[PDB]
Amino acid sequence: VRSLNCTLRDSQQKSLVMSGPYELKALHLQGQDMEQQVVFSMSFVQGEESNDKIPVALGLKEKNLYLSCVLKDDKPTLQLESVDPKNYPKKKMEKRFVFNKIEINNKLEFESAQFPNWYISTSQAENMPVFLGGTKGGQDITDFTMQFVSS
């Protein structure tokens, strides 16, 4: 498995930070305060691919913590799940962990491989949880930029 280290910023320039053990929040940060931002370990895993659609897994750099999509109270939900530190990452990652990384401009969208047309999204408001949104366009933000830190 090949990985790259990177940070993500939504299109409103909000940064992503850990709120608790299992949640990420998005907030407007600038300055030394940016040390707070989560560093992701993006892995290129097995799955269907295209020029513009690439399967990935998002773990937290150096933590056996991955972004996962599960049904919770009957609706697709994003969560941080802990994994056996010795078995991960893998090349053939379980479906709940896979996102389709879609390039559209200098922007990126992350679609659940498990739940078609469900995307990693942020709210327009400050300090709200990052979640899985079943809708594109309307109010919630579904596009991001990536910064390499050391892949």
Curated annotation (Swiss-Prot):
Activation of the IL1B precursor involves a CASP1-catalyzed proteolytic cleavage. Processing and secretion are temporarily associated. (Microbial infection) Cleavage by S.pyogenes cysteine protease SpeB promotes its activation independently of CASP1. It comes from the Eukaryota. Signal peptide: none annotated. Keywords: Cytokine, Cytoplasm, Inflammatory response, Lysosome, Mitogen, Pyrogen, Secreted. A motif (Involved in interaction with TMED10 C-terminus) lies at residues 110-123. The record marks 53, 61, 63, 72, 86 as: Important for interaction with integrin. (Microbial infection) Cleavage by S.pyogenes cysteine protease SpeB promotes its activation independently of CASP1. SpeB-mediated maturation of IL1B plays a dual role depending on infection site: while IL1B inflammatory response prevents bacterial growth during invasive skin infections, it promotes streptococcal infection of the nasopharynx by disrupting colonization resistance mediated by the microbiota. One of its GO terms (biological process) is regulation of ERK1 and ERK2 cascade. It is found in: Cytoplasm, Cytosol; Secreted; Lysosome; Secreted, Extracellular exosome. Expressed in activated monocytes/macrophages (at protein level). GO terms for molecular function: cytokine activity; integrin binding; interleukin-1 receptor binding; protein domain specific binding. Potent pro-inflammatory cytokine. Initially discovered as the major endogenous pyrogen, induces prostaglandin synthesis, neutrophil influx and activation, T-cell activation and cytokine production, B-cell activation and antibody production, and fibroblast proliferation and collagen production. Promotes Th17 differentiation of T-cells. Synergizes with IL12/interleukin-12 to induce IFNG synthesis from T-helper 1 (Th1) cells. Plays a role in angiogenesis by inducing VEGF production synergistically with TNF and IL6. The IL1B production occurs in 2 steps, each being controlled by different stimuli. First, inflammatory signals, such as LPS, stimulate the synthesis and promote the accumulation of cytosolic stores of pro-IL1B (priming). Then additional signals are required for inflammasome assembly, leading to CASP1 activation, pro-IL1B processing and eventually secretion of the active cytokine. IL1B processing and secretion are temporarily associated. This is Interleukin-1 beta. The gene is IL1B.
